[PDB]
């Protein structure tokens, strides 16, 4: 049940020797709402073929996501170009306080409570890039234990 939601449908065009070749570009986010989420951008002469190719690309590149108590473990800033997205842990109940492309990514990943603010640009591809970068740099409290030789997070 990998649900998918369009996050942007732009109208790109090149110029030839007379006229304008117009192709639709779609940005689809696919997520199983259990820890797997990917993004795919595709271009085609028509929306249906563009959507099919974008979903195919998105399903080809699926990253693995870990959730802690339904939220994000530690506050993180994802950077991608000039877009910086701040994610902050939230108590169980606030809901997803995100909006736009980031909100779509968080819902499709599985996370519930999440504090976000877009501190940079409003271009959907870079915000999604920043969101995925922020979520992928996250450190579990068990990897640092193997690293720092602590006691499975114990004080």
């Amino acid at each position: 049940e990998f649900e998918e939601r369009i996050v942007k449908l732009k109208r790109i065009s090149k110029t030839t020797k007379g006229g304008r070749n117009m192709r639709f570009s779609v940005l689809v986010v696919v997520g199983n709402r259990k820890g797997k989420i990917g993004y795919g951008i595709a271009k085609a002469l028509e929306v249906p073929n563009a959507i099919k190719k974008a979903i195919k690309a998105a399903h080809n590149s699926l990253h693995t996501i870990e959730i802690h108590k339904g939220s994000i473990y530690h506050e993180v800033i994802g950077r991608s170009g000039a877009s910086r997205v701040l994610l902050k842990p939230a108590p169980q109940g606030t809901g997803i306080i995100a909006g736009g492309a980031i909100r779509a990514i968080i819902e499709l990943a599985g996370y519930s409570d999440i504090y976000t603010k877009n501190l940079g640009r409003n271009t959907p591809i870079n915000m999604i890039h920043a969101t995925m970068d922020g979520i992928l740099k996250q450190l579990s409290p068990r990897r640092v234990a193997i690293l720092r030789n602590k006691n499975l997070n114990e004080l």
């Binding site: 473990y73 530690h74 506050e75 450190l139 409290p141 640092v144 690293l147 720092r148 030789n149 602590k150």
Partner: protein
């Protein structure tokens, strides 16, 4: 132990060590050297207790007039470090003093915060245990 190169260090003592650690991590280098100071010596002792570096040896010259500390980083088998990011709080000029009620928690306790309250440098958790705060040196996670 002998050397061949001259050893220099920056005038600001927290970020000098911080720059050494960060550059070595990014460049995959392991063994680095710097001049030894007691504040720098104490912060390295708590770091090895927290398990971010492997060994930390302070040395002295044959005349007892100079000391240089040469530390190495703790890389795993696949060669990825334990330190992820370092950031200094009480920079020169603007010194950061926070009371106990505002003692920070770095990455929900995953990282360690260095606080030298009254008994030398001290970790955030034990600072909370004693309910006493003070100078905050740097964030390490």
């Amino acid at each position: 132990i002998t050397t061949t190169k001259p050893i220099k260090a920056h005038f600001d003592p927290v970020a000098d060590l911080l720059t050494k650690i960060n550059n070595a991590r990014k460049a995959k280098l392991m063994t680095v050297t710097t001049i030894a100071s007691k504040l720098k010596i104490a912060i390295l002792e708590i770091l090895v207790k927290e398990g971010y570096l492997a060994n930390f040896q302070v040395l002295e010259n044959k005349s007892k007039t100079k000391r240089i500390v040469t530390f190495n980083l703790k890389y795993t088998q696949r060669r990825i470090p334990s330190i992820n990011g370092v950031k200094q709080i009480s920079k020169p000029g603007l010194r950061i003093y926070r009371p106990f009620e505002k003692l920070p928690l770095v990455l929900n306790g995953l990282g360690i915060a260095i606080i030298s309250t009254s008994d030398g440098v001290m970790t955030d958790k034990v600072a909370r245990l004693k309910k006493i705060g003070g100078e905050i040196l740097a964030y390490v996670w």
